[PDB]
Design a binder for these strands. Structure first.
Ligand SMILES: [K+]
Ligand SMILES: [K+]
Ligand SMILES: [K+]
Ligand SMILES: [K+]
Ligand SMILES: [K+]
Ligand SMILES: [K+]
Ligand SMILES: [K+]
Ligand SMILES: [K+]
Ligand SMILES: [K+]
Ligand SMILES: [K+]
Ligand SMILES: [K+]
Ligand SMILES: [K+]
Ligand SMILES: [K+]
Ligand SMILES: [Mg+2]
Ligand SMILES: [Mg+2]
Ligand SMILES: [Mg+2]
Ligand SMILES: [Mg+2]
Ligand SMILES: [Mg+2]
Ligand SMILES: [Mg+2]
Ligand SMILES: [Mg+2]
Ligand SMILES: [Mg+2]
Ligand SMILES: [Mg+2]
Ligand SMILES: [Mg+2]
Ligand SMILES: [Mg+2]
Ligand SMILES: [Mg+2]
Ligand SMILES: [Mg+2]
Ligand SMILES: [Mg+2]
Ligand SMILES: [Mg+2]
Ligand SMILES: [Mg+2]
Ligand SMILES: [Mg+2]
Ligand SMILES: [Mg+2]
Ligand SMILES: [Mg+2]
Ligand SMILES: [Mg+2]
Ligand SMILES: [Mg+2]
Ligand SMILES: [Mg+2]
Ligand SMILES: [Mg+2]
Ligand SMILES: [Mg+2]
Ligand SMILES: [Mg+2]
Ligand SMILES: [Mg+2]
Ligand SMILES: [Mg+2]
Ligand SMILES: [Mg+2]
Ligand SMILES: [Mg+2]
Ligand SMILES: [Mg+2]
Ligand SMILES: [Mg+2]
Ligand SMILES: [Mg+2]
Ligand SMILES: [Mg+2]
Ligand SMILES: [Mg+2]
Ligand SMILES: [Mg+2]
Ligand SMILES: [Mg+2]
Ligand SMILES: [Mg+2]
Ligand SMILES: [Mg+2]
Ligand SMILES: [Mg+2]
Ligand SMILES: [Mg+2]
Ligand SMILES: [Mg+2]
Ligand SMILES: [Mg+2]
Ligand SMILES: [Mg+2]
Ligand SMILES: [Mg+2]
Ligand SMILES: [Mg+2]
Ligand SMILES: [Mg+2]
Ligand SMILES: [Mg+2]
Ligand SMILES: [Mg+2]
Ligand SMILES: [Mg+2]
Ligand SMILES: [Mg+2]
Ligand SMILES: [Mg+2]
Ligand SMILES: [Mg+2]
Ligand SMILES: [Mg+2]
Ligand SMILES: [Mg+2]
Ligand SMILES: [Mg+2]
Ligand SMILES: [Mg+2]
Ligand SMILES: [Mg+2]
Ligand SMILES: [Mg+2]
Ligand SMILES: [Mg+2]
Ligand SMILES: [Mg+2]
Ligand SMILES: [Mg+2]
Ligand SMILES: [Mg+2]
Ligand SMILES: [Mg+2]
Ligand SMILES: [Mg+2]
Ligand SMILES: [Mg+2]
Ligand SMILES: [Mg+2]
Ligand SMILES: [Mg+2]
Ligand SMILES: [Mg+2]
Lengths: 122, 50, 21, 94, 38, 94
RNA sequence: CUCGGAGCAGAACCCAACCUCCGAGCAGUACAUGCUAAGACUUCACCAGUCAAAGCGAACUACUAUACUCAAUUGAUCCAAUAACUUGACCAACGGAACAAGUUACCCUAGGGAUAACAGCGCAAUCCUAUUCUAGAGUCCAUAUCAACAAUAGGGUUUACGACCUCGAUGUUGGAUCAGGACAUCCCGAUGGUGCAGCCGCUAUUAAAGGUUCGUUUGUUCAACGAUUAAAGUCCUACGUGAUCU
RNA sequence: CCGAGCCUGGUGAUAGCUGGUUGUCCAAGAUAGAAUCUUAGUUCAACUUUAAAUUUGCCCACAGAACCCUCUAAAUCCCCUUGUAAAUUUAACUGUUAGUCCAAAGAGGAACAGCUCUUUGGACACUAGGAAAAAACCUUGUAGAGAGAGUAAAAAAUUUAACACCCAUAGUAGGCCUAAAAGCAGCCACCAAUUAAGAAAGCGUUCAAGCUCAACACCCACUACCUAAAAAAUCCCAAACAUAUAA
RNA sequence: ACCCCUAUACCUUCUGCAUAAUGAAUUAACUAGAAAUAACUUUGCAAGGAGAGCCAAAGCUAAGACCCCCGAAACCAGACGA
């Protein structure tokens, strides 16, 4: 019978080789996720369809930010085959009230607080 | 056979993908495939599978 | 329960000689 | 075509995504007066702002939650010290 | 349909069939063939 | 002369299907994406103990809005002007 | 054909087959198995069924004593019997119609390819063929020839199975007529082997251009028989072909 | 036009059965079972729809849920947090209750079926792309216009059987058994001559002869020690290509 | 205009129909959803409502809004027919 899958915890234990490959820092884990759905929920069990709705991933290729906490990660582990998970990067820190309207999320996962639409002078 | 599994240069193995439910592959696999690891299909045994 | 670590705590027939005429 | 190359340069895979080719105004008045913002760009500006505010809201909740947990741990440590004090022992030890 | 165990080799699902092809054994390939070295 | 008994893709005897070169590459490409997802789920920012209760206030207030909207259902107000304006259908020039 | 236990259904519940097994239509002991009443369970509805603290009244200061032991151990309404209490069906087709069997090819109507006979299709148990294996037979000799126990493939001609198309119709044997095709070749051609002297044969490779009889009996396909022939081949074609015929 | 006439009337007989059922637009919408002279139907549940009330619903952390027993199964139940926005109750009803394939755990058959029966999930009975055509596999869903753009799934690979050369005397026809057994029908031993050769590994002879192998010598045979085919009936079946920087 | 590219009529019935399942030559005309019980919605009046009856522990009165067509073989009565 096809039932829900229990993923062993050994799968989610990063080796030192993995850290070098992906550049993550285990001592400074990223605060937020960037979850994007890249696979259809059709031809998948209903519990995967429901979790996608809970995460706000109804529309594919639409980035969504979620907190890097065990409860949120538990939902991600169920539909990890339908999504792309990337860490959110803040080169200039969190957006402030002054630059709320000048933010953009680049394809590299970086949220830039200034977006001038001009070439760099350097 | 143990040597073949040790020096296997393929980054992807049946055991790793099936146990981790990668790609949702367990929707087309069997619960016995968690322990057979792709070496057995029905009554048939495939010695070349690693 | 089976999955719990306390599985089989109530087993007693393995301590008794099998009397099956 | 060339979606992967654009990703390697930090650009959007689809050229219609973020960038000067899309977000810049398509036209302006001949005398130089700027045109009103395009309705598509207004939708993206509002959608980006909500995403930016959600990032701040999630970050502040985790920061506040971490402080609350740390505050509880500090409070728990102090409670153990107070219970140690009691009446002076007597009897055999005196 | 057919049961889990069949006398003939049952046709695998295409998703499973692609998994078998991807996870084939790849023997290590030396940079220089051993017969070409002393 | 070569025909598949019954339907092609169902039954005991099926038309064989073979994995092309690009079929393998597509599966490997998606396998690499999921492998990176495993890495980013291995480093939670907070533990389960620290996470507890950090968003209870917002969640409770969010549901109170749902309750408020659910219990606010009522017929709309009715105005005299709306009823009287129907007399304008026979308005004529003098 | 109703009810209960176990497997299928391995761990909360549930879960079918004209599925695999074992049983029930009682018995025994009490005579407070008296009355009443929170909160619950429930056989996937309902009906029905199940457990119950407290309290009243008893028992009791020995009695695993307080809703008997026991798994199922059973039947609604109406109605009938009775002063009352209460009782009454193998209504077993067991949610039960108060009481009604055969036959129809003399048949009719409404439908159904939701469902059989016909053909197609699926399948290959059965049937057929090849190869692998080398016990045995062939005086000796496994492989001239034949072949056991088994193994791996293939064919879709037999008998079955399934019920997918057709019941606001897809007309059945055999024959006549015309034949199309397959080769797993009966004859004719070309070859290998032989337990091939020759003459006749056996076996295998290759070959589908050509040919493959007339009659007695039988509705016959067959089969038996007569006389021949270089030979009187095996099958498919909606068991080829009835808007061509019988 | 008689298994019992015909006409009229009851009669608009009845039909769980078949057929048909008329303007535009949008929205929600595929559903465990139980009983039934019942399985071609109905009623109650379930599911679905509308309106309404007010409050948790779903996803789930530990802790927790059986002994008997062969599979020490995949899992489930419970469940705060969290991510989410639904859920229950009240009022009023209809329809669905003749199911198909795929994956998985099983049962029946033949470890047959496009077979049959359950369970978990998917898809179909809705869109579009792909696997050639294609309900059931893959990709993908929320709707319009565009002579823009990035992508998803998405093309079938493979071609196999050479092999050594050279050389051989002898105790002795070992004993026993046996008509005969002489290396080679059985039994026992399996010692020894020659630098070198088993009281004989495979053939052969009625028994013996006879032909090989294991010996010496010569000498770099300086070997792979992983395997195997084909046949159907109208007419093969896209055309083709081994070479220009992986997109 | 055609040539190019794309496209398996419709209704019904079904698990599923281009289906070689059903009906249809075509035109015009004719030919098929009738209502209580409550409930809902909108007025009136209000512990009363209603133009005797009836209902009423916010009810009551009034209105709006839901329920098809064709077809048997038969049965019976009374006539008419050798
Ligand atoms: K088939
Ligand atoms: K009955
Ligand atoms: K069969
Ligand atoms: K028929
Ligand atoms: K011929
Ligand atoms: K005759
Ligand atoms: K019926
Ligand atoms: K001898
Ligand atoms: K029709
Ligand atoms: K019909
Ligand atoms: K057809
Ligand atoms: K049809
Ligand atoms: K027909
Ligand atoms: Mg199965
Ligand atoms: Mg076909
Ligand atoms: Mg059980
Ligand atoms: Mg259940
Ligand atoms: Mg119940
Ligand atoms: Mg009591
Ligand atoms: Mg009954
Ligand atoms: Mg019952
Ligand atoms: Mg009755
Ligand atoms: Mg007769
Ligand atoms: Mg009659
Ligand atoms: Mg009839
Ligand atoms: Mg049928
Ligand atoms: Mg049926
Ligand atoms: Mg017929
Ligand atoms: Mg048939
Ligand atoms: Mg036919
Ligand atoms: Mg076959
Ligand atoms: Mg012999
Ligand atoms: Mg011989
Ligand atoms: Mg066989
Ligand atoms: Mg046939
Ligand atoms: Mg069937
Ligand atoms: Mg017809
Ligand atoms: Mg004929
Ligand atoms: Mg012919
Ligand atoms: Mg031939
Ligand atoms: Mg041939
Ligand atoms: Mg000739
Ligand atoms: Mg010769
Ligand atoms: Mg015929
Ligand atoms: Mg004809
Ligand atoms: Mg005929
Ligand atoms: Mg007459
Ligand atoms: Mg009628
Ligand atoms: Mg009837
Ligand atoms: Mg809709
Ligand atoms: Mg009855
Ligand atoms: Mg029914
Ligand atoms: Mg639940
Ligand atoms: Mg909860
Ligand atoms: Mg109803
Ligand atoms: Mg079926
Ligand atoms: Mg289903
Ligand atoms: Mg239907
Ligand atoms: Mg297509
Ligand atoms: Mg869209
Ligand atoms: Mg000697
Ligand atoms: Mg001797
Ligand atoms: Mg001899
Ligand atoms: Mg010897
Ligand atoms: Mg000799
Ligand atoms: Mg030699
Ligand atoms: Mg061609
Ligand atoms: Mg083409
Ligand atoms: Mg076309
Ligand atoms: Mg049908
Ligand atoms: Mg079609
Ligand atoms: Mg036609
Ligand atoms: Mg038609
Ligand atoms: Mg019909
Ligand atoms: Mg007409
Ligand atoms: Mg009406
Ligand atoms: Mg009405
Ligand atoms: Mg009619
Ligand atoms: Mg009568
Ligand atoms: Mg009469
Ligand atoms: Mg007369």
């Amino acid at each position: 019978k096809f039932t829900r899958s229990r993923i062993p915890e050994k799968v989610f234990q990063a080796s030192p080789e993995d850290h070098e490959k992906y550049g993550g820092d285990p001592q400074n884990p990223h605060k937020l996720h960037i979850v994007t759905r890249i696979k259809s929920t059709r031809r998948r069990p209903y519990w995967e369809k429901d979790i996608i709705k809970m995460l706000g991933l109804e529309k594919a290729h639409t980035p969504q930010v979620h907190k890097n906490i065990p409860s949120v990660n538990a939902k991600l582990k169920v539909v990890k085959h339908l999504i792309r998970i990337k860490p959110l990067k803040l080169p200039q820190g969190l957006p402030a009230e002054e630059n709320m309207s000048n933010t953009c999320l680049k394809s590299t996962g970086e949220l830039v607080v200034q977006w001038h639409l001009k070439p760099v002078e350097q | 056979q143990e040597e073949r599994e040790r020096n296997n240069q393929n980054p992807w193995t049946f055991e790793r993908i099936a146990t981790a439910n990668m790609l949702g592959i367990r929707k087309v696999l069997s619960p016995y495939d968690l322990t057979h690891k792709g070496k057995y299909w029905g009554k048939f045994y495939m010695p070349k599978r690693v | 329960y089976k999955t719990k670590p306390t599985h089989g705590i109530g087993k007693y027939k393995h301590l008794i000689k099998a009397e099956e005429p | 075509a060339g979606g992967q190359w654009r990703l390697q340069q930090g650009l959007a895979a689809n050229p219609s995504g973020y960038g000067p080719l899309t977000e810049l105004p398509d036209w302006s008045y001949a005398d130089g007066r700027p045109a009103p913002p395009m309705k598509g760009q207004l939708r993206r500006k509002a959608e980006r702002e909500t995403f930016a505010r959600r990032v701040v809201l999630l970050s502040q909740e985790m920061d506040a939650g971490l402080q609350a947990w740390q505050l509880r741990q500090q409070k728990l440590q102090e409670e153990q010290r107070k219970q140690e004090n009691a009446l002076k022992p007597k009897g055999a030890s005196l | 349909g057919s049961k889990a165990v069949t006398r003939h080799r049952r046709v695998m699902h295409f998703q499973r069939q692609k998994l078998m092809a991807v996870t084939e054994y790849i023997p290590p390939k030396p940079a220089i063939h051993p017969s070409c070295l002393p | 002369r070569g025909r598949i008994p019954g339907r092609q893709w169902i039954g005991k005897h099926r038309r064989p299907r073979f994995v092309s070169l690009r079929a393998k590459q597509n599966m490997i490409r998606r396998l690499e994406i999921e492998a990176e997802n495993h890495y980013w789920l291995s480093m939670p920012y907070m533990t389960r103990e620290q996470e507890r209760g950090h968003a209870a206030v917002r969640r409770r207030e969010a549901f109170e809005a749902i309750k408020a909207a659910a219990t606010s259902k009522f017929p709309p107000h009715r105005f005299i002007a709306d009823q009287l304006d129907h007399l304008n259908v026979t308005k004529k020039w003098s």
